[PDB]
């Protein structure tokens, strides 16, 4: 396939932020539940 | 467009139908477990409103707007045939349950069929009358079909009225036989098979009778042409399906199973 | 014993347009498969369109399972890129 | 209706950071749900 | 009965931009509003019933 | 029982389990060979810059690819069905034992001669004696005579269970209202373990089976002492 | 406008988009459930609770992965987007019924999530066998909510099947025979026929379970002369076809991906591929009792079900060999989609071969209700169906969105997922041969090493799932618009551009005879 | 044709219904109900019915449908 | 007598009817022998076979139902 250059380029820093936010959105809520199992 | 197919206007009825399904199922749950019919009665009401408006719109699209080209009609033919096939396989599951239980009666039954303590209906009395009624209705609907193709409004209406009257007669006879039956749905696998299989059949008779009554009012309003009348064809195919299921129930449950 | 309308009397909208065109041997709504010409530059397949381009599928030989798809544009006849069969747009 | 890239979807991609928030809430809520149902069952 | 299909063809082909489910006129809007209100209200009630049934 | 880092079947305790091991060896060779050939051919298709992208004729090659698999399936089915019918063969048992599945324990009935029955429960982890196995020991083992054909009849008094002893090649569903038969013959004395093998609720993981295979004379005295 | 477009749709592409979003969300639910399973099993002892909470998680895992992730993505998503485009049709036959197939799924999912929230959940297995699933051993609403979830999912799929069969039969160009339609279109038509015939039998069976639970019927209750084994026959008469329903659209996407990235105009042996899919569909109806080899059926019945099941290897092998013959001589493009497809060919083959082991009733006595079965079906589902979904997603994302993925990120994603799924499931073969049962919250100590490794694998797969969400974000964040796509002459779905207009084929294709 | 199917409706189908109606008519009237025996495979109650007192079937006929404890 | 022999009428995994038939046969024989005040020792083979094969709870349930008058088999 060919494609145009990005209309809104995502820099390495911007990618680190999106990847970090993505991973935290999975890991923090599950981690909170599993940390608190004994309490439950 | 330079094809013959129907681009349907954006419609709310798929969503109201899907939500009616949620309300009926959550409603049955609320009735079986939380002693309340309220959700179920909302779901049945929204289901009937959805069906009414959706099929009203199909009539608007076809009779009033002309979107049912031969290509569109051919698609509807396939859709109704495929729907009937799915309904056949649904009944196949109940016949399987019936043959499984009756061909290998367990010790709890007395090791015999019919089970100890079951007094079956006489298949030569009301069950035979029901058979004559649905077979007769298969003949009258065929008369109605040919009258419509021949352009005869009065005879189409008379034949279709006779067909509906026989469907109603079958339903009243079945209601009476349910009340008179000395066995119930709780009378082991005999009652279970008898009432669930005949009960789903009775529901299909009511659905098919309703479809025929829709066709009767559409005919009164001149919707059908002598060549274009798919709703009538579909109702007739459905009605033959209901007849054929009855004949299998009669031979299997009422006669061979007695 | 009458009283049932005919399609001639009561068909409307696209159903009626298809009905009236078929009486005249015409196919404006593409119900029929078009019959091929020899497909030479002198005798190209004539492809009707209501715009200035239309997709052609070329079944290059009878019973090929592979259909070759391409846009045909208004102007000089184009060739199927697999078999070289000529097609000319008639807008 | 709007046609073309970023327009044939029920969510906006006009702002990549708003989109990150929306995607976070969407996928995160699905992944979280079973942990919170387990918590619910353990707490009865 | 008289054949009034032509008058319904004219009504449902009127160039007024209405979708087919509203093209009959004001009664269609009322029946739409009743249907959608029962559906959405019933759905909110089904969610309340889940909340209630989720605890002893 | 299984041992740590085990790759294959528990060692055969019965002749039919021996047969199943040899049949599995034959079948696994075929699985290995076909898996390996597909991986090798993928790698062969992907490692050349040479090309041929014009239409390719299929019919000759499809003969090889249907016939060779058909022959391989026949070579699996033949010994598969020999073993199926061997297990089903008439053997003349010396003893009949019944087991009833319950939530969550097994009961055993030895009613050829006297009214012997008892319940068999998992030893709780906190009550294991030193050297005993977590989740596998029971209070009352299924004592049976070694080197003898035994008819085991299996049912349930509640939900589905399944009575399994892997080292004897045994797994029979425990269905209420149904009496399922299997045959058991141990070539050796010892202790042979199994676990409930149909999801049956809260303690499905915790209702094991222990057979204790001993000489007939020991089995007879044990039977008498359990009345 | 937003409500009209997204809640009142009559458009095949927008409805396909709704299905892909729904399936993606379902995949996150099913992944979380899979991690709860592996967290419980990842060290000896008890983490969550006893087998009831554990088997509620296992049961929900299966229903979510099958009915809310795989079927909606393959059939509702890829099928709605691609089938009309691949036959030059302006939409589906029943564009408004199509929208109802979609909107039945959120309510179906809501009933499943309600089942798990009320009482103690439905800890039954996805098979829902009585009497554990009956009103004594599972009293209260959970199992009824599960049955109603299945009813709504089944109506969705039955109406969808009617739509696909009608569209594929009736809405091709008049010159195009069935033997000139692409293999993906065949794969959807055959899957639709399987749905139409199988789901009504499931409907009958779970309806019988509902009446045994609520109306004092005794279909499955020996006290009334019923039989728990009748339920198993009705369930599996649906359940074997269902696994072919799960893989057939995968087979169709694999054919297109292998052809495309081999630089070929056509798959090898088109009519053999059609024959193979129809043969698998047919044979798929006559093998169900290989799920019942331990229930006590007669020896001759076991012999028949062994033999009939093994026959499926012949048409399936023709497909595997035909994919290899499509690669043969290719100008191979090592795209991420091609990597998914190559992983599929190998890993599907392994799982199909462990299925042939299981087809042998004598050996199945020892393997039934063990992790050997779990290893078999996760090779074909978590490495077959899922690899076909991921290959199709990365191949067609630019068509659907008009934007490109970052191919390097997509290759990283593939590599992590490949390691995770193999680490998860390969060791389960050893656990099954050595006798570890299914649906256990805890295991004898001997099984610890392989359970530990399996759970570590599941966490690697989680990392791949998290990265996939980032990779989709990065594509929409960066907005690299598609320009040129190769091989449009043999891939009609691309010929209207990326994304295609809301209305395509308003003027149909010209195809002569 | 329509004429032939009308001939079959009135000449064969409705006469058949009339004769079966006559047959049913002549065999109507109540048969003596059998001695109640509390068989465990009949009058199943695993869960109360969702109507009435929970112990009556939906089309309960007191004359011919005994309860688990016998006739009313 | 050691245990119930192979019976060609019941050759398959499902032995339900074997237990049932032998329980019926014992009780039919016992009724036939007690009616004439004949000898129930002639019924002994059926007794041994049903006792060997039948779960204790099945026999116990069937006996209770014969006492109650709710046994559904013909004796
Ligand atoms: C158990 C349940 C099962 C759950 C299943 C979930 C999956 C469902 C699938 C269907 C998705 C929903 C779409 C239809 C209804 C949406 C309603 C709504 O408001 O949504 C706004 C929202 C988008 O917000 P936006 O960006 O503000 O709107 C742009 C509009 O153009 C601008 O529009 P506007 O300005 O005219 O009006 C917008 C406004 C108002 O719009 C309206 O007027 C609509 C109001 C009626 C709502 C009816 C729909 C309800 C949703 C149905 C499901 C329930 O809405 C908002 O902005 C706020 C609404 C907030 C509610 C969001 C609810 C969405 C679903 C949530 C997920 C489930 C949560 C469960 C919780 C579990 C916890 C234990 O749409 C979504 O919900 C989309 C999901 C988020 C996007 C994630 C992207 C992921 C990419 C993955 C790739 C796969 C695709 C590959 C190919 C792609 C190329 C083609
Ligand atoms: C990327 C993914 C990352 C992580 C993946 C997880 C890694 C798992 C590590 C396994 C290492 C096993 C081990 O402890 O090795 C010691 C082990 C010690 O040997 P041993 O105790 O004498 O075992 C000989 C057995 O008695 C031989 O008799 P057995 O009855 O004890 O053998 C049964 C065993 C035998 O199976 C194996 O040994 C599996 C080998 C797999 C290779 C990959 O089990 C199986 O049947 C496995 C079924 C597998 C299904 C089909 C797989 C298709 C293969 C694909 C072909 C492509 C090849 C290139 O070393 C080996 O034999 C290597 C295996
Ligand atoms: C996508 C899903 C999927 C697919 C396609 C399959 C495909 C197959 N399955 Fe499987 N199966 C499951 C999903 C699937 N299965 C699930 C979910 C269960 C468990 C259900 C439950 O209990 O919850 C299961 C259970 C299951 C059992 C029951 C085991 C038990 O419970 O004890 C059996 C028994 O025969 C079976 C067999 C097979 C066979 C023979 C095929 C065949 O179709 C495979 C054919 C493929 C090949 C053989 C490979 C390619 C061929 C070649 C390279 C040619 C050469 C090969 C030879 C000569 C052998 N599977
Ligand atoms: C499609 C079906 C499917 C899939 C994909 C999986 C995936 C996984 N499954 Fe399972 N599983 C089943 C179906 C499936 N499973 C079934 C039917 C059972 C039997 C239930 C029963 O016994 O009743 C079962 C049982 C089962 C068990 C046995 C439980 C027991 O017997 O006690 C285990 C144990 O480890 C397991 C683990 C996992 C793991 C770790 C994954 C991981 O590989 C999952 C990793 C994540 C993914 C693969 C991503 C998924 C998401 C997408 C692909 C979304 C894509 C998004 C876009 C395209 C935009 N599952
Ligand atoms: C002339 C006959 C017409 C039938 C109309 C009767 C009732 C309404 C429902 C009809 C639908 C049909 C079948 C549903 C199940 C059972 C009813 C069977 C027929 C019937 O009416 O059976 C009665 C019992 O009804 C009962 O329990 C009543 C139970 C009422 C609640 C029904 C629960 C609904 C079940 C869910 C349906 C699921 C559908 C699946 C869709 C598939 C999706 C893929 C029999 O009465 P009785 O007193 O036991 O015996 C007679 C004694 N004198
Ligand atoms: C107590 C009982 C309550 C239960 C609820 C269900 C009850 C009743 C439902 C009864 C079904 C009524 C269907 C009415 C359809 C009217 C629309 C119609 O018939 O539309 C026709 C098209 O057919 C088409 O869509 C064909 C459409 C076919 C739909 C048929 C569906 C059968 C429905 C089954 C529903 C549930 C069954 C499941 C049970 C388990 C319109 O085309 P024509 O006729 O050619 O007209 C055009 C000419 O005028 C031109 O000259
Ligand atoms: C306890 C409760 C659990 C069950 C939940 C119930 C589920 C859902 C609630 C249903 C709401 C139904 C509302 C009516 C739907 C009518 C569909 C219809 O009639 O669809 C037609 C196509 O299907 C055709 O023909 C032929 C097919 C017509 C089928 C009609 C409806 C079937 C509903 C249930 C079917 C399951 C089958 C049972 C067998 C297992 C029309 O297609 P459209 O795309 O609209 O238009 C196309 C235009 O060109 C027309 O001018
Ligand atoms: C299967 C999916 C899950 C995989 C594993 C997830 C990886 C964990 C991610 C982090 O999760 C967090 O971990 C913290 C601990 O590291 C928790 O804080 C807890 O512990 C802290 C340290 O004691 C306290 O300060 C906090 O108050 C307390 O909430 C916090 O709640 C939780 O969100
Ligand atoms: C536009 C929408 C807004 C309107 C809201 C709807 C209002 C519904 C109120 C009616 O409530 C009902 O009350 C009945 C009387 O209490 C209940 O019968 C219940 O109690 C009866 C009394 O004994 C029993 O006989 C029945 O079996 C039993 O289901 C019934 O379940 C319940 O639905
Ligand atoms: C789509 C398919 C639809 C199928 C419809 C329903 C099928 C019912 C057919 C009868 O079923 C049989 O029942 C026998 C008992 O009546 C079984 O005998 C088994 O069970 C008996 C005790 O229950 C034993 O005495 C026998 O030896 C033993 O072989 C036999 O295997 C089985 O085939
Ligand atoms: C369009 C919007 C949608 C409309 C939503 C309307 C919701 C209003 C429902 C009213 O709720 C009622 O509450 C009753 C009690 O307060 C319940 O009675 C039932 O439960 C009672 C419990 O006290 C008992 O008397 C009986 O079981 C029975 O009468 C019954 O569940 C329900 O009808
Ligand atoms: C004659 C046109 C259609 C006839 C269908 C078959 C007639 C069925 C009659 C019922 C008996
Ligand atoms: Cu008992 Cu599992
Ligand atoms: O199901 O294999
Ligand atoms: Cu199967
Ligand atoms: Mg099992
Ligand atoms: Na654990
Ligand atoms: Xe194999
Ligand atoms: Xe859950
Ligand atoms: Xe869930
Ligand atoms: Xe589901
Ligand atoms: Xe279903
Ligand atoms: Zn050409």
mmCIF file of C-alpha atoms in Angstrom, chain G residues 58-173:
data_model
loop_
_atom_site.group_PDB
_atom_site.id
_atom_site.type_symbol
_atom_site.label_atom_id
_atom_site.label_comp_id
_atom_site.label_asym_id
_atom_site.label_seq_id
_atom_site.Cartn_x
_atom_site.Cartn_y
_atom_site.Cartn_z
ATOM 1 C CA UNK G 58 -14.810 -19.946 32.910
ATOM 2 C CA UNK G 59 -18.460 -20.096 31.651
ATOM 3 C CA UNK G 60 -18.574 -16.317 30.928
ATOM 4 C CA UNK G 61 -15.095 -16.483 29.271
ATOM 5 C CA UNK G 62 -16.393 -18.986 26.713
ATOM 6 C CA UNK G 63 -19.751 -17.288 25.988
ATOM 7 C CA UNK G 64 -18.088 -13.855 25.592
ATOM 8 C CA UNK G 65 -15.228 -15.138 23.344
ATOM 9 C CA UNK G 66 -17.603 -17.211 21.112
ATOM 10 C CA UNK G 67 -20.891 -15.250 20.887
ATOM 11 C CA UNK G 68 -19.727 -11.647 21.540
ATOM 12 C CA UNK G 69 -16.169 -11.570 20.089
ATOM 13 C CA UNK G 70 -15.613 -14.138 17.282
ATOM 14 C CA UNK G 71 -19.079 -14.333 15.686
ATOM 15 C CA UNK G 72 -19.790 -10.560 15.720
ATOM 16 C CA UNK G 73 -16.304 -9.699 14.336
ATOM 17 C CA UNK G 74 -16.155 -12.407 11.592
ATOM 18 C CA UNK G 75 -19.813 -12.512 10.480
ATOM 19 C CA UNK G 76 -21.333 -9.210 11.596
ATOM 20 C CA UNK G 77 -18.175 -7.114 11.012
ATOM 21 C CA UNK G 78 -16.101 -8.543 8.138
ATOM 22 C CA UNK G 79 -19.202 -10.160 6.572
ATOM 23 C CA UNK G 80 -21.320 -6.928 6.525
ATOM 24 C CA UNK G 81 -18.379 -4.758 5.367
ATOM 25 C CA UNK G 82 -16.965 -7.113 2.702
ATOM 26 C CA UNK G 83 -19.736 -9.355 1.256
ATOM 27 C CA UNK G 84 -21.700 -6.588 -0.515
ATOM 28 C CA UNK G 85 -18.476 -4.976 -1.794
ATOM 29 C CA UNK G 86 -17.090 -8.339 -3.070
ATOM 30 C CA UNK G 87 -20.256 -8.989 -5.187
ATOM 31 C CA UNK G 88 -20.837 -5.370 -6.284
ATOM 32 C CA UNK G 89 -24.147 -5.199 -4.343
ATOM 33 C CA UNK G 90 -25.513 -1.821 -3.133
ATOM 34 C CA UNK G 91 -26.301 -3.231 0.354
ATOM 35 C CA UNK G 92 -27.647 -6.411 2.059
ATOM 36 C CA UNK G 93 -31.054 -7.889 0.983
ATOM 37 C CA UNK G 94 -32.740 -6.824 4.314
ATOM 38 C CA UNK G 95 -30.864 -3.694 5.404
ATOM 39 C CA UNK G 96 -33.272 -2.889 8.265
ATOM 40 C CA UNK G 97 -33.391 -6.531 9.584
ATOM 41 C CA UNK G 98 -29.524 -6.337 9.454
ATOM 42 C CA UNK G 99 -29.637 -3.452 12.006
ATOM 43 C CA UNK G 100 -31.788 -5.619 14.325
ATOM 44 C CA UNK G 101 -29.184 -8.469 14.182
ATOM 45 C CA UNK G 102 -26.702 -5.877 15.524
ATOM 46 C CA UNK G 103 -28.961 -4.272 18.196
ATOM 47 C CA UNK G 104 -29.939 -7.673 19.699
ATOM 48 C CA UNK G 105 -26.292 -8.132 20.835
ATOM 49 C CA UNK G 106 -25.975 -5.372 23.499
ATOM 50 C CA UNK G 107 -29.121 -6.709 25.235
ATOM 51 C CA UNK G 108 -27.806 -10.311 24.899
ATOM 52 C CA UNK G 109 -24.519 -9.150 26.568
ATOM 53 C CA UNK G 110 -26.487 -7.285 29.298
ATOM 54 C CA UNK G 111 -28.373 -10.513 30.151
ATOM 55 C CA UNK G 112 -25.065 -12.418 30.378
ATOM 56 C CA UNK G 113 -23.509 -9.746 32.675
ATOM 57 C CA UNK G 114 -26.785 -9.845 34.773
ATOM 58 C CA UNK G 115 -26.456 -13.692 35.090
ATOM 59 C CA UNK G 116 -23.027 -13.161 36.755
ATOM 60 C CA UNK G 117 -24.262 -10.320 39.088
ATOM 61 C CA UNK G 118 -27.399 -12.061 40.491
ATOM 62 C CA UNK G 119 -27.270 -14.914 43.050
ATOM 63 C CA UNK G 120 -23.977 -16.893 42.653
ATOM 64 C CA UNK G 121 -23.821 -16.688 38.804
ATOM 65 C CA UNK G 122 -24.137 -19.552 36.296
ATOM 66 C CA UNK G 123 -21.184 -21.836 37.121
ATOM 67 C CA UNK G 124 -22.271 -24.445 34.602
ATOM 68 C CA UNK G 125 -19.727 -24.526 31.788
ATOM 69 C CA UNK G 126 -20.747 -22.954 28.418
ATOM 70 C CA UNK G 127 -22.524 -26.304 27.664
ATOM 71 C CA UNK G 128 -25.042 -25.564 30.540
ATOM 72 C CA UNK G 129 -25.601 -29.305 31.293
ATOM 73 C CA UNK G 130 -28.403 -30.327 33.627
ATOM 74 C CA UNK G 131 -28.878 -31.218 36.352
ATOM 75 C CA UNK G 132 -26.108 -28.821 37.588
ATOM 76 C CA UNK G 133 -27.840 -26.090 35.430
ATOM 77 C CA UNK G 134 -31.316 -27.144 36.824
ATOM 78 C CA UNK G 135 -33.483 -25.371 39.433
ATOM 79 C CA UNK G 136 -32.154 -27.458 42.436
ATOM 80 C CA UNK G 137 -28.345 -27.233 41.887
ATOM 81 C CA UNK G 138 -28.584 -23.708 40.274
ATOM 82 C CA UNK G 139 -31.717 -22.241 41.953
ATOM 83 C CA UNK G 140 -32.512 -18.598 41.094
ATOM 84 C CA UNK G 141 -32.249 -16.352 38.044
ATOM 85 C CA UNK G 142 -28.581 -16.828 36.829
ATOM 86 C CA UNK G 143 -29.125 -19.782 34.464
ATOM 87 C CA UNK G 144 -32.436 -18.319 33.123
ATOM 88 C CA UNK G 145 -30.592 -15.039 32.278
ATOM 89 C CA UNK G 146 -27.917 -17.157 30.515
ATOM 90 C CA UNK G 147 -30.637 -19.013 28.534
ATOM 91 C CA UNK G 148 -32.269 -15.684 27.509
ATOM 92 C CA UNK G 149 -28.800 -14.264 26.539
ATOM 93 C CA UNK G 150 -28.427 -17.290 24.190
ATOM 94 C CA UNK G 151 -31.991 -16.782 22.832
ATOM 95 C CA UNK G 152 -31.245 -13.170 21.819
ATOM 96 C CA UNK G 153 -27.783 -14.067 20.374
ATOM 97 C CA UNK G 154 -29.457 -16.920 18.463
ATOM 98 C CA UNK G 155 -32.213 -14.719 16.967
ATOM 99 C CA UNK G 156 -29.486 -12.198 15.985
ATOM 100 C CA UNK G 157 -27.505 -14.901 14.114
ATOM 101 C CA UNK G 158 -30.582 -16.646 12.526
ATOM 102 C CA UNK G 159 -31.834 -13.354 11.052
ATOM 103 C CA UNK G 160 -28.235 -12.529 10.010
ATOM 104 C CA UNK G 161 -27.934 -15.955 8.294
ATOM 105 C CA UNK G 162 -31.223 -15.346 6.367
ATOM 106 C CA UNK G 163 -29.807 -11.964 5.309
ATOM 107 C CA UNK G 164 -26.394 -13.321 4.134
ATOM 108 C CA UNK G 165 -27.814 -16.334 2.244
ATOM 109 C CA UNK G 166 -30.432 -14.135 0.472
ATOM 110 C CA UNK G 167 -27.832 -11.406 -0.340
ATOM 111 C CA UNK G 168 -25.233 -13.896 -1.680
ATOM 112 C CA UNK G 169 -27.815 -15.886 -3.770
ATOM 113 C CA UNK G 170 -29.898 -12.959 -5.102
ATOM 114 C CA UNK G 171 -27.675 -9.833 -5.357
ATOM 115 C CA UNK G 172 -24.659 -10.781 -7.503
ATOM 116 C CA UNK G 173 -24.227 -9.280 -10.981
#
